[PDB]
Scaffold this active site. Structure first.
Site, short mmCIF file in Angstrom:
data_model
loop_
_atom_site.label_atom_id
_atom_site.label_comp_id
_atom_site.label_asym_id
_atom_site.label_seq_id
_atom_site.Cartn_x
_atom_site.Cartn_y
_atom_site.Cartn_z
CG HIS A 145 -3.29 -0.13 7.43
ND1 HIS A 145 -2.95 0.44 6.58
CD2 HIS A 145 -4.58 1.01 7.87
CE1 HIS A 145 -3.36 1.70 6.22
NE2 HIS A 145 -4.14 1.86 7.01
CG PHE A 191 -11.11 -0.78 12.11
CD1 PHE A 191 -11.07 -0.07 10.93
CD2 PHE A 191 -12.35 -1.17 12.44
CE1 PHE A 191 -12.49 0.21 10.31
CE2 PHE A 191 -13.55 -0.97 11.73
CZ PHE A 191 -13.41 0.18 10.44
CG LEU A 192 -8.48 -5.40 17.83
CD1 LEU A 192 -7.94 -4.22 18.58
CD2 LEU A 192 -9.98 -5.83 18.60
N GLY A 193 -7.93 -5.85 13.73
CA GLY A 193 -6.76 -6.82 12.89
C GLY A 193 -5.56 -6.17 12.74
CG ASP A 194 -4.10 -1.78 11.65
OD1 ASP A 194 -5.18 -1.35 11.13
OD2 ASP A 194 -3.36 -1.36 12.26
CD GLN A 195 -6.37 -0.20 16.46
OE1 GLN A 195 -6.98 -1.19 17.30
NE2 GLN A 195 -6.84 0.93 16.24
CD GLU A 197 -1.27 2.24 2.28
OE1 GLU A 197 -0.56 1.74 3.13
OE2 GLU A 197 -1.81 3.39 2.01
CD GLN A 257 -4.08 2.22 14.47
OE1 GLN A 257 -5.27 2.12 14.30
NE2 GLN A 257 -3.23 2.59 13.25
#
Length: 341
Positions: free
Chosen positions: A307, A283-287, A10, A100
């Site tokens: 991400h 979101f939590l998946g990348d974090q 990305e 993050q």
């Protein structure tokens, strides 16, 4: 030293932020090239420098190439030491993107780390701060991490003016996260805010979101917040509390976009996140990625994002092969930690 290709995938700021964070955690120096290639305005911008400088402070690092417009950066950490962090990101630069990155680094300090960050709390192309406070921290607690993230003042695009304060504790006891499918939704909660705008903005957002989520047949409680800052702005986040983790959905207010649509969109995002029946939202998946390398476990995600793939790329560039990934970007996925470090 470890060299990261900033044009990978990305090719934006995420790869940049996570790389410095991992350098800070591992103590291994890092060179990042082709910074922000996949952008209208390639290279380091002021927002990226604030993040870099904060981590430099935490790690007493030597840094080279940290200039506006630079395409290449070298970051050489020394020992990680608990310092009070203050960061003033320009205008409505995203607090949550800085945070993050900072979070995984800060929990590896030996003492409590306190922080104050000004900038945008609720801006597009990043999670709203209320998502970090109510969804992200909830998940991190499961693996042994404790902290607070508090909105002192809201900041929106373009004026900014946001103030966020918090801390994390040292991650002394790490435990694994096993989060595959959820069994049931227990309740929905949310926060609908309006700043320098009529209170009906927060109300109508909340009401529209609630209407759209009645179909789930669980209690719904969306709090409203009417606040003051240096400019107008609004937004709403809703989250489903399950037997496992919270999944979240959000939307931002916009001039000429009615409050009902904003509320409906946040609800629809939550509904989209819940659809696969997987525990971890997109979101939590990348974090979670930088933390999971150290906690171990397995997460099933509603949607694999760029991400997430970027974060895995960076972490494995530092730590060797760590993750097994089943699923393509844009699809539900399964992420297993094969080897914990």
């Amino acid at each position: 030293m470890i060299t990261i290709d900033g044009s990978y995938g990305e090719g934006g700021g995420q790869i940049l932020r996570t790389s410095v964070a991992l350098s800070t955690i591992t103590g291994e120096p890092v060179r990042i090239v082709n910074i922000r290639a996949n952008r209208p305005n390639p290279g380091l911008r002021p927002q990226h420098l604030h993040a870099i400088l904060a981590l430099k402070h935490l790690a007493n690092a030597e840094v080279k190439g940290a200039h506006v417009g630079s395409r290449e950066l070298v970051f050489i950490p020394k020992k990680l030491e608990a310092k009070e962090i203050s960061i003033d990101i320009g205008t409505a630069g995203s607090i949550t993107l800085v945070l993050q990155a900072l979070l995984p680094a800060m929990v590896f300090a030996r003492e409590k780390v306190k922080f104050r960050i000004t900038g945008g709390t609720d801006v597009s192309w990043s999670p709203p701060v209320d998502y970090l406070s109510n969804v992200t921290l909830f998940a991190l607690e499961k693996i042994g991490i404790h902290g607070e993230i508090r909105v002192i003042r809201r900041g929106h695009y373009p004026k900014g003016g946001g103030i966020v304060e918090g801390y994390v504790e040292p991650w002394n006891e790490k435990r694994e996260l096993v989060a595959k499918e959820y069994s049931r939704i227990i309740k929905i909660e949310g926060i609908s805010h309006a700043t320098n705008l009529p209170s009906h903005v927060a109300e109508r957002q909340a009401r529209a979101a609630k209407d759209e989520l009645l179909q789930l047949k669980v209690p719904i409680e969306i709090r409203t917040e009417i606040s003051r800052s240096i400019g107008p702005g609004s937004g709403i986040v809703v989250w489903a509390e399950t037997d496992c983790l919270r999944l979240g959905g959000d939307a931002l207010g916009k001039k000429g976009k009615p409050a009902e649509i904003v509320g409906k969109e946040a609800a629809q995002e939550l509904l989209d996140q819940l659809k696969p029946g997987h525990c971890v939202d997109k979101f939590l998946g990348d974090q979670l990625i930088p933390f999971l390398a150290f906690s171990g476990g397995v997460i099933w995600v509603s949607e694999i994002t760029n991400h997430l793939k970027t974060n895995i790329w960076v972490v494995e560039s530092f730590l060797g092969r760590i993750f097994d990934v089943d699923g393509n970007v844009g699809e539900p996925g399964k992420i297993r930690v094969i080897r914990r470090v």
